[PDB]
């Protein structure tokens, strides 16, 4: 079975800039049956290039494909806003087709440190016997960030989850929310709830906290 490697997996580039995405194949791709697809969040993939270099009509001409054998390249001559997306390579030259893991092209911008907010559980939730504490990291870049929870300065583990938004189309930032969950009885055994944040834009890690 043929492995296709798209590396790097993420490219941060500026609007208007040039982009070249690599797709290296573990074995020679028969008849250069190599395709490229674009996909945006909440949408089905769109075919961009086929046969290594052939572009269907309707597909924008700033997209070109090249290479043969085991070494292929997609070039985006100029990055328009709608081109920040994930791009997938695929071989279909065998009777077995495979896909590369994809490369995400995101908008590069200045380092922005998160605004950090914490929310204690609402009275309404407590009555039901559970307590959720939310830590909001708002409008940062780059994507990489880290939250750790500390309850009376004890490093928490296994009782929190987080999710990140897609890159904002206006300001090109990301936001993250972490949720810490304890039963009501457990929440009432402790005083200080704190979320500690690590990010490139902060020289030292930031803590927001409250006292139950």
């Amino acid at each position: 079975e043929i492995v296709l490697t798209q590396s790097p997996g993420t490219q941060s580039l500026s609007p208007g800039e040039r982009a070249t995405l690599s797709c290296r194949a573990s074995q020679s791709v028969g008849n250069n049956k190599l395709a490229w697809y674009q996909q945006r969040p909440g949408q089905a993939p769109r075919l961009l290039i086929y046969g290594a270099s052939s572009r269907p009509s309707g597909v924008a001409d700033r997209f070109s494909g090249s290479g043969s054998g085991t070494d292929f390249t997609l070039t985006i001559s100029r990055l328009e806003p709608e081109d920040f997306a994930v791009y997938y390579c695929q071989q279909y030259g065998q009777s077995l087709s495979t896909f590369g893991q994809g490369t995400k092209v995101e908008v590069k911008r200045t380092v922005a440190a998160p605004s950090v907010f914490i929310f204690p559980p609402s009275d309404e939730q407590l009555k039901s016997g559970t307590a959720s504490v939310v830590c909001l990291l708002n409008n940062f870049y780059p994507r990489e960030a880290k939250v750790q929870w500390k309850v009376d300065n004890a490093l928490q583990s296994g009782n929190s989850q987080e999710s990140v938004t897609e890159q904002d189309s206006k300001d090109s930032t990301y936001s993250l929310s972490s949720t810490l969950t304890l039963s009501k009885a457990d929440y009432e055994k402790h005083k200080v709830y704190a979320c500690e944040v690590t990010h490139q834009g902060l020289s030292s890690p930031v803590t927001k906290s409250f006292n139950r």
């Binding site: 049956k33 075919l47 929310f119 039901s128 959720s132 939310v134 708002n138 990140v164 969950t181």
Partner: protein, 221 residues
């Protein structure tokens, strides 16, 4: 050419799912049709393909033994059938047809996938339909507030603020899947601290499967 798929499905672990793909336009029987899946936040994975005229089928090694793909020429419909389901099969499943070269859709075949269905979400879980609870995330010159939408199944949930009138600063997060089998999400918005007195903030939550529709006022204190 239009690939319309069957709708979302919840399935018990160990069971089987059948997803259909109705193609309208061009010539159904002569062009390759493939099934591709995408687990949440993951890449595209090819599963198999058929050519209805020849009944010639190929299956990804990963899925061979667990999967059957058939094409029904009389109804111009393709079917994916996947067996012995596990949580890691939770994914969006796509049908995709190979493209053609020229004006119209009776051209020479290109192999690559020009046409795609809208997707069918198949959720593999033991959980049952449940509405979320909706809890405010109360504000403390920039303030943050929100709604915690907790313990619902299945996806999806849509959230808005003041019926769509408030969109600036709004971040609605992808759901996380709790250890309970239930999903949770929250939606936040930053706003000016001075307007917490003038302006009213309301998150509108919609979970169609349980018919939960809450318009929740979020305020300070």
């Amino acid at each position: 050419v239009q690939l319309v798929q069957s709708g979302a499905e919840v399935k018990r672990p160990g069971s089987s799912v059948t997803v259909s793909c109705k193609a309208s336009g061009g010539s159904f029987s002569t062009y390759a049709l493939s099934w591709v899946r995408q687990a949440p936040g993951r890449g595209l994975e090819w599963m198999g393909g058929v050519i209805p005229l020849l009944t010639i089928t190929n299956y990804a090694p990963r899925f061979q033994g667990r999967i059957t793909i058939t094409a029904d020429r009389s109804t111009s419909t393709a079917y994916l059938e996947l067996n012995s389901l596990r949580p890691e099969d939770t994914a969006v499943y796509y049908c995709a047809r190979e493209g053609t070269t020229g004006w119209g859709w009776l051209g020479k075949p290109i192999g690559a996938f020009a046409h795609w269905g809208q997707g069918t979400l198949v959720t593999v879980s033991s959980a049952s339909t449940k509405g979320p609870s909706v809890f405010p995330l109360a504000p403390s010159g920039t303030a943050a507030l929100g709604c915690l939408v907790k313990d619902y199944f299945p996806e999806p949930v849509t959230v808005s603020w003041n019926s769509g009138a408030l969109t600036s600063g709004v971040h609605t997060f992808p759901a996380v899947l709790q250890s309970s089998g239930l999903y949770s999400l929250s939606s936040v918005v930053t706003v000016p601290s001075s307007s917490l007195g003038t302006q009213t903030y309301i998150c509108n939550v919609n979970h169609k499967p349980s018919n939960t529709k809450v318009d929740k006022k979020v305020e300070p204190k």
